[PDB]
Paper text:
Correct pairing of two different LCs with their respective HCs is achieved by a CH1-CL-domain crossover in one of the Fabs. To reveal potential structural effects of the crossover procedure on the resulting bispecific antibodies, we report the crystal structure of a human Angiopoietin 2 (hAng2) binding “CrossFab”, i.e. a Fab derivative in which the VL domain is fused to the CH1 domain, while the VH domain is fused to the CL domain (“CH1-CL crossover” in).
The molecule regions directly affected by the CrossFab design, i.e. the elbow and adjacent regions, show clear electron density in unbiased composite omit maps, indicating a defined geometry and low flexibility. Moreover, no significant difference in the kinetic parameters kon and koff was found, indicating that the structural features relevant for target binding are maintained in the CrossFab. The lower thermal stability of the CrossFab might be attributed to fewer stabilizing contacts between the variable and the constant domains in the CrossFab compared to the Fab.
Numbering used by the authors:
A (entry chain L): 1 to 210
B (entry chain H): 1 to 234
The structure:
Amino acid sequence: QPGLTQPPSVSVAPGQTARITCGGNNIGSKSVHWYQQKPGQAPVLVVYDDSDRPSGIPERFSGSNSGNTATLTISRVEAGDEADYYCQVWDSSSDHYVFGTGTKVTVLSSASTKGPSVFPLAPSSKSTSGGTAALGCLVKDYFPEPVTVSWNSGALTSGVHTFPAVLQSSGLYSLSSVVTVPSSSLGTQTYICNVNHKPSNTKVDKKVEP
Amino acid sequence: QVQLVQSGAEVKKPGASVKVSCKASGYTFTGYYMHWVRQAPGQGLEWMGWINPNSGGTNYAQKFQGRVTMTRDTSISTAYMELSRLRSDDTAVYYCARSPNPYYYDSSGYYYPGAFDIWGQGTMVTVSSASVAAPSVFIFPPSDEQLKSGTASVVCLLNNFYPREAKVQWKVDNALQSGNSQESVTEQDSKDSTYSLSSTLTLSKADYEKHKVYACEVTHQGLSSPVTKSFNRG
């Protein structure tokens, strides 16, 4: 356990309590600092230690630690709490500053867990002018994150570009996954997009052709 | 009020060296340690090191030990960080964060040694080794099944372009669109070192039938004149 480890992602609905964990050696006997970083902004020091927190910072943020684990507890989560969170420790013996791996937290729309609807992105015009054809999959209206999307069950990793998701106004996610191949290949062989969405325990396989 | 102001965004090349300034205000410069900590896009925070403005002394991490030098000017109350022998994975946002000297208790009331109580706004630093390339713009009309769903989504795909900076605008009946489309970008850093962009313009079916014509316009640096890709029913 050389560094500080945190769960990569935590999601919670408004009004709930979010508990973020931090792992390390002899952390309970140490002071643990928690920083918050909203998208495109600088980190801010949220919790120095336990309930000791800087000026102008909500009483809902509280710190804790026992043995090898520490915990940032966010009581009554609000939409504004949606940001990345980093635990941090200082070893005064070797004068080392260590951050955590980071925890992306999200405030849910409280929408029902929904399986994705994958529509085909068919090439016709694009194939022609380029000398290279772009075909794809439009994975629409799923919740929550994430989905994994392969092509031909992993038979090709060459031209595939899997884009990040976006949060629609419906509170659901839209995903795009494209791949580029020559027209010659486009004519003869089959192209299957394989969508695997764990949170709904479903999966779809869609055929993309001329 | 206490504030830290860093130098503007900078663009460099592999092998070169970058310098970043940090201007402190609203407090005693010599009373606090000044740290430098960076983060790569979509990565975690990584401590680079500290300088003590009062004595000028420094302490670097073992990773950056040889390449980085942190200096200071007390007169203008400014700290500096220089990174040499730059490579591509040094591409990151660089923050300067203040941390209380354990030997200097302040009248502020909040004695927080070991923590970074104040952060700068950050400085963007890019290392390329990549030529400037125009996008490959493709377009996709909505699938028939999606039309059966009642909604329609047209997709604009800008492929293998450099740099990130690009403009996308949607035209229905030669008319500019605002407040409908959403977009996303992927950085492939392996070979191309380029960014691919997916834009999705979403309308209802009714507007889709009643409007009768669709085009996607894109303006980029690497291309001479704005490229428009068009498509329609038929």
